[PDB]
């Protein structure tokens, strides 16, 4: 990895994979878990009101 | 695949409920992700295995 | 170790400058750390190498 400026492809792919994975963790907890918990409550309320 | 294959109106109510929950969490998820990425924006140092 | 071994007044001025900078930034660091740790609180998934 010492000649990063000589090999931009592998470097940019490493950055992309890293950003992707840590963002994936925070996403899974926050957005995904909140969806699993809030979604049924919203379905019930909106269907009843409809 | 669900039992709401017909009744497109109620199906739309369900779909729109999902959409509104996701919309409610979207910003908080995004901001939290950018805060979690704050260190990698400064120096996304790459490990040899990565 | 510096040239300010003597002069406890000047030295303590330097020390208090460091102290007030750290005190100023302390809150943002703590809250940001809890936000960044929010995913590992829910599931601190352990990889075989860890």
Swiss-Prot record, chain A:
Changing residue 26 to D: Abolished GTPase activity. This is Dynamin-like GTPase MGM1, small form. Residues 1-50 are annotated as: Stalk region. It is found in: Mitochondrion intermembrane space. Constitutes the soluble short form (S-MGM1) generated by cleavage by PCP1, which plays a central role in mitochondrial inner membrane fusion and cristae morphology. The transmembrane long form (L-MGM1) and the S-MGM1 form higher-order helical assemblies that coordinate the fusion of mitochondrial inner membranes. Inner membrane-anchored L-MGM1 molecules initiate membrane remodeling by recruiting soluble S-MGM1 to rapidly polymerize into a flexible cylindrical scaffold encaging the mitochondrial inner membrane.
